[PDB]
Amino acid sequence: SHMAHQDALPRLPVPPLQQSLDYYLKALQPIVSEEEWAHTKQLVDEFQTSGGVGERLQKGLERRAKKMENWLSEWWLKTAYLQFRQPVVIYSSPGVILPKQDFVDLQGQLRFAAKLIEGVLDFKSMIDNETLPVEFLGGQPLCMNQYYQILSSCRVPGPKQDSVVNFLKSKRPPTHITVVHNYQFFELDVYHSDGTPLTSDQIFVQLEKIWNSSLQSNKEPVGILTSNHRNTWAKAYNNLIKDKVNRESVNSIQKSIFTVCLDKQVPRVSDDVYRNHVAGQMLHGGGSKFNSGNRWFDKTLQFIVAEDGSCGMVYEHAAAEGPPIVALVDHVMEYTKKPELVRSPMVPLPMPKKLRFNITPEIKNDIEKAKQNLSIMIQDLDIMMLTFHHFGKDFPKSEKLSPDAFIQVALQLAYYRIYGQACATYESASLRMFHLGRTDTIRSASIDSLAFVKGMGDSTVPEQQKVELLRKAVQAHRAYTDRAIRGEAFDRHLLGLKLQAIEDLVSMPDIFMDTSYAIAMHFNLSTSQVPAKTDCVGFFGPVVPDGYGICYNPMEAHINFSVSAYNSCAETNAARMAHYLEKALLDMRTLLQNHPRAK
Numbered sequence: 212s213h214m215a216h217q218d219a220l221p222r223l224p225v226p227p228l229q230q231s232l233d234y235y236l237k238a239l240q241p242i243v244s245e246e247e248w249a250h251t252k253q254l255v256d257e258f259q260t261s262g263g264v265g266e267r268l269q270k271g272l273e274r275r276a277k278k279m280e281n282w283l284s285e286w287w288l289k290t291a292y293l294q295f296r297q298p299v300v301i302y303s304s305p306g307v308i309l310p311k312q313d314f315v316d317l318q319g320q321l322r323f324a325a326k327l328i329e330g331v332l333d334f335k336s337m338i339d340n341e342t343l344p345v346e347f348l349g350g351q352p353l354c355m356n357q358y359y360q361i362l363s364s365c366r367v368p369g370p371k372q373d374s375v376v377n378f379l380k381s382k383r384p385p386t387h388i389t390v391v392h393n394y395q396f397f398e399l400d401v402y403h404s405d406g407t408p409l410t411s412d413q414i415f416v417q418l419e420k421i422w423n424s425s426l427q428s429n430k431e432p433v434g435i436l437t438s439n440h441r442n443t444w445a446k447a448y449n450n451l452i453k454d455k456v457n458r459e460s461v462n463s464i465q466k467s468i469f470t471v472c473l474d475k476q477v478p479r480v481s482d483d484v485y486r487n488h489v490a491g492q493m494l495h496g497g498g499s500k501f502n503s504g505n506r507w508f509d510k511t512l513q514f515i516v517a518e519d520g521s522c523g524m525v526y527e528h529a530a531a532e533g534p535p536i537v538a539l540v541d542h543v544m545e546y547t548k549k550p551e552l553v554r555s556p557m558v559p560l561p562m563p564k565k566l567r568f569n570i571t572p573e574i575k576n577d578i579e580k581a582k583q584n585l586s587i588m589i590q591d592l593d594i595m596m597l598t599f600h601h602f603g604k605d606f607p608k609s610e611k612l613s614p615d616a617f618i619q620v621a622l623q624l625a626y627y628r629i630y631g632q633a634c635a636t637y638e639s640a641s642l643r644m645f646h647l648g649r650t651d652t653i654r655s656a657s658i659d660s661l662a663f664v665k666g667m668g669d670s671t672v673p674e675q676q677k678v679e680l681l682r683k684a685v686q687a688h689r690a691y692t693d694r695a696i697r698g699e700a701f702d703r704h705l706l707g708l709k710l711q712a713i714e715d716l717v718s719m720p721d722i723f724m725d726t727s728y729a730i731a732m733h734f735n736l737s738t739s740q741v742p743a744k745t746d747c748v749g750f751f752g753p754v755v756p757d758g759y760g761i762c763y764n765p766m767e768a769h770i771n772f773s774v775s776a777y778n779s780c781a782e783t784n785a786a787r788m789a790h791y792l793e794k795a796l797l798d799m800r801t802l803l804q805n806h807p808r809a810k
């Protein structure tokens with residue numbers, strides 16, 4: 212947004228070596244053995260010894276920060292996503308489920324879909340004009356650069372590493388979106404000649420023509436190719452755009468402000484697994500026979516409107532971060548409720564261009580391969596959506612406790628109860644207080660948390676002592692959260708030293724080849740909060756085979772949880788973890804309330 216605003220932002224810092232290495236050792240203690248900790252302790256010293264390797268790398272990062280807006284920007288985007296060759300589906304692109312809608316027929320589906328498009332465009336006008344209210348936290352400005360990445364962009368396959376294209380602010384910014392129905396894509400202009408955007412009514416009419424221009428699911432699901440392994444997809448992608456029409460269709464999708472998916476009717480399932488499936492539809496689409504082919508997963512923003520009223524979205528992480536999405540969601544959902552205006556007399560409206568795809572025996576073979584790959588993926592994903600009705604932010608806040616810290620500590624209590632030990636845990640922290648900041652790591656497994664979980668279950672340790680261990684565990688977490696937000700966390704900084712070493716062509720340092728670093732970066736628990744005003748929830752796959760993906764939205768009197776795991780690992784089960792997590796949240800409340808402070 213405002214130039215003055217972004218110009219006042221502090222630039223991402225490089226924390227002091229001794230600081231980050233100290234925090235590093237503290238965070239390792241709860242997850243490694245003493246031998247492993249002792250050895251890592253020795254390696255940590257050698258790394259920071261006078262005139263040693265650590266210093267040369269450290270100064271490298273400091274120089275790097277003087278010559279760049281953000282010393283970590285390109286590096287994070289590159290190593291976390293563009294270089295991640297796993298399919299973006301389930302493994303990277305977050306899935307979001309919005310509050311169900313009440314439409315009961317097709318027309319209601321097109322109507323809502325239309326309202327939503329107008330909603331996003333209203334949100335877009337604010338971003339174009341730079342009128343979107345500048346944001347703050349505690350009184351510190353927050354970078355607004357993430358709002359410019361989510362629209363009119365698209366991930367691009369690469370034989371070695373992908374890339375991201377953005378056209379929001381080009382000479383001829385896009386004015387069309389892409390709509391896909393029954394696997395067929397269309398190019399729909401959402402603005403008139405005079406810049407004014409179409410209306411909810413003008414949109415609905417266009418979507419109707421599209422619906423008609425694809426009555427049957429009688430075409431190849433080209434789009435499903437975007438969900439295969441990035442290396443496989445890069446080859447199939449290249450072979451796909453060897454054709455002029457294909458290339459032109461693809462090109463149209465890449466520049467489209469965003470994509471809207473009008474899903475087809477799917478079989479009915481028992482109620483107790485209904486939410487689970489809906490999430491599946493938003494996360495991955497359900498598979499080859501359902502709506503997976505009704506997607507273009509490279510697209511930064513994909514809004515999904517189900518046939519049964521459900522709806523949600525899925526964004527590609529390369530160019531999308533949490534904050535923008537949350538803001539867009541809240542603003543759009545609210546807009547779809549704001550009463551319209553008298554129908555703007557209808558003016559002549561063109562036919563939405565259909566983006567055809569010439570199929571060849573090779574393009575068709577890749578598609579069959581993509582169906583098969585995705586199918587395996589879905590069959591391995593274990594999801595359990597938990598709606599914690601017991602309480603939300605109200606309880607923790609009435610106890611003068613941060614709800615996020617509380618939930619995180621509950622999760623630690625739940626994991627320990629199941630496995631009898633703690634594990635490397637990750638919780639997304641927003642680095643937005645700094646120019647171009649995306650995220651840093653908050654480590655939920657701490658000295659205090661383990662102390663709390665052990666004691667919590669120790670028959671000898673008194674309830675009163677348990678409650679004190681709990682309060683310490685929560686506060687420790689909150690502090691870490693605040694620290695990570697101010698750039699005092701250490702994970703990104705450690706990554707930087709390593710990358711700096713590689714860049715300078717220096718032998719990989721011992722500190723990184725260390726078993727302890729392998730364990731510290733192997734996140735059996737991957738988490739993130741979605742602090743939305745809308746009663747929605749996010750979800751994503753575990754970052755490790757034997758791990759869980761947990762995402763939550765704390766509401767006032769309840770909490771929306773998503774828990775994911777992989778079937779290929781017998782030691783992890785979604786339901787069980789969700790079941791324990793609930794019990795952990797409740798035992799924590801019971802414990803807190805039975806041992807108050809004073810009167």
Ligand SMILES: C[N+](C)(C)C[C@H](O)CC(=O)O
Pocket residue numbers: 305533638639640649650651737738739751754
């Ligand atoms: C899901 N997870 C934590 C892997 C990615 C986060 O949503 C974004 C981040 O932490 O950079």
